[PDB]
Structure 1
Amino acid sequence: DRLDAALRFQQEALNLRAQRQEILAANIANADTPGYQARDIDFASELKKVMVRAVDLLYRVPDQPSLDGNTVDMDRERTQFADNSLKYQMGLTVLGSQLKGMMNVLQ
């Protein structure tokens, strides 16, 4: 509702970034266990669904086989983790700027 929805868009984006960060950290910590499949969430589609709304995570394609059945690749996971952290901080900065502007309007 007005202020609520305008802030809610960025709040939901930030929450989705946090959940994706949690999934990435989980599948990085679990990177040395046989029989594990790397998981991730389609951020753009998930955010679009939530904006007009319990996340539907999906598997990640392997790039080179391993006998033990592990599909998590450390370099790709690290790059994705860094990208997600930067996106999270960017969203935090945008949200903080909007809130600070809204507060300063009342002064």
Structure 2
Amino acid sequence: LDRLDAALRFQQEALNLRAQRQEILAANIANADTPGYQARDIDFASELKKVMVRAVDLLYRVPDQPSLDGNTVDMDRERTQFADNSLKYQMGLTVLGSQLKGMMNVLQ
């Protein structure tokens, strides 16, 4: 790679993984009522570590309580997951922005 991308590759990959994870969370929110559905999620830490070496596998979420229709997407746990995922996405966004602003300010 290059000296510039070497610094920001980690943050870019973190942002991309956050976007994909939020997409999966939105998908299993939208499919909350389809019977026979299984909630899916990404092992964020392991996937990030694997990516920062060189698609993404899906891990089924353990059902909270059983239901007759076969649907296994919870609501409260996934809502907390979505909220915290958005919060950490914004954290990564502002960290990358601060790094880029510092790099630009050094060159003035």
Q: TM-score, normalised by structure 2?
A: 0.97
Unmatched 5+ stretches in structure 1: none
Q: Say what the alpha-carbon RMSD is for the aligned residues.
A: 0.6
**DSSP-derived class of the 2:63 partner:** coil
Deviations 1:32-89 (A, max 9, x none): 1100000000000000000002101110000110000011111111000001000000
Paired residue for 1:55?
56
- Runs of 4+ aligned residues of structure 1 deviating over 4 Å after TM superposition are none
How far is 1:2 from its partner?
Answer: 1.4
Alignment partners' CA distance in 1, 2:66 and 2:8: 44
Name stretches of at least 5 consecutive residues in structure 2 with no aligned partner.
none
Tell whether 2:36 aligns with 1:42.
no
- CA apart distance, 1:27: 0.4
Structure-to-structure mapping, 1:63-78, within 5 angstroms: 63-78=64-79
User: How far off is 1:92 after superposition?
Assistant: 0.0
Aligned residue-pair number: 107
Percentage of matched positions with identical amino acids? 100
Q: Secondary structure at the match of 1:52?
A: coil
